[PDB]
Paper text:
In vitro, these interact specifically and selectively with two CCAN components, CENP-C and CENP-N. Binding of these proteins to CENP-A nucleosomes has been shown to require two regions where the CENP-A sequence diverges significantly from that of histone H3, the L1 loop and the C-terminal tail. In conclusion, the structure of CENP-N contains an N-terminal Pyrin domain, a central CLN-HD, and a C-terminal CENP-L dimerization domain, while CENP-L contains an N-terminal CLN-HD, interrupted immediately before the C-terminal helix by an insertion that contains a region required for CENP-N dimerization.
CENP-N1-235 consists of two closely juxtaposed domains that interact through an extended interface to form a single structural unit. There is no clear density beyond residue ~210, indicating that the structure is disordered after this point. Fold-recognition by DALI identified similarity of the first domain to PYRIN domains (PYDs; a superposition is shown in Figure 2—figure supplement 1A–B). Besides identifying the N-terminal domain of CENP-N1-235 as a PYRIN domain, DALI also identified an unanticipated structural homology of the second domain of CENP-N1-235 with the N-terminal domain of Iml3CENP-L. We therefore refer to these domains of CENP-N and CENP-L as CLN-HD (for CENP-L and CENP-N homology domain). Our study did not identify a clear structural basis for this phenomenon, as we failed to identify significant conformational changes in CENP-N in isolation (crystal structure) compared to its complex with CENP-ANCP.
Residue numbers in the entry: 1 to 90, 97 to 213
């Protein structure tokens, strides 16, 4: 693996608290049960991380594997970002249809972008987008996270600056599922569970 992907995995593991480490890594399901047995987790973090980075080399970790561990960190630490709610207005054959559509729209608009996915059993997708330009590489340390619940008109994003790549994200989301318009709602929270609670409650009154 490249030193860029190796560094990203290092900084990701470094910010994981020690007690959580063994649970996140199992959830990641990239390093094997056998590989992880060789690691003793009861010393300095710096020793733990270099052993784990070695194990990623053995397993030939790509950027996609790195991006997936990052999603899992975020899934276990949703509170670290402020989530905005977005509403769409109006069928897919599949979730795979959405993922390929969405990925292409972004990677055609700009050339350098990392678009990764994780599916949860709620018919929901986590999207992680690391933005780059036509000329510059993707910034893996300032990514955008999207949580789209497929059978709803609702999508939840983590806004950091609300950049020039923010109208494009709306566009891509809107096009990739069978929707015509997107609008930002005036609903912010650090807690996604609490936002789900308001938008899916008032989605049940109207329909």
């Amino acid at each position: 693996m490249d030193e860029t992907v190796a560094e990203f995995i290092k900084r990701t593991i470094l910010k994981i608290p020690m007690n959580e480490l063994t649970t996140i890594l199992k959830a990641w399901d990239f390093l094997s049960e056998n590989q992880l047995q060789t690691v003793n987790f009861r010393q300095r973090k710096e020793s733990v991380v270099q052993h784990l980075i070695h194990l990623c080399e053995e397993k030939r970790a790509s950027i996609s594997d790195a991006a997936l561990l990052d999603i899992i960190y975020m899934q276990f630490h949703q509170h670290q970002k402020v989530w905005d709610v977005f509403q769409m207005s109006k069928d897919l054959f599949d979730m795979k249809q959405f993922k390929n559509s969405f990925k292409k729209i972004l990677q055609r608009a700009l050339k350098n972008v990392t678009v990764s996915f994780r599916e949860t059993e709620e018919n929901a997708v986590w999207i992680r987008i690391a933005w780059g330009t036509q000329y510059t590489k993707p910034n893996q340390y300032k990514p955008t996270y999207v949580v789209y619940y497929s059978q709803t008109p609702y999508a939840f994003t983590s806004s950091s600056m609300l950049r020039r790549n923010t109208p494009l994200l709306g566009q891509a989301l809107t096009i990739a599922s069978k929707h015509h318009q997107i609008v930002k709602m005036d609903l912010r929270s650090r807690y996604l569970d609490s936002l789900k609670a308001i938008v899916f409650k008032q989605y049940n009154q109207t329909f």
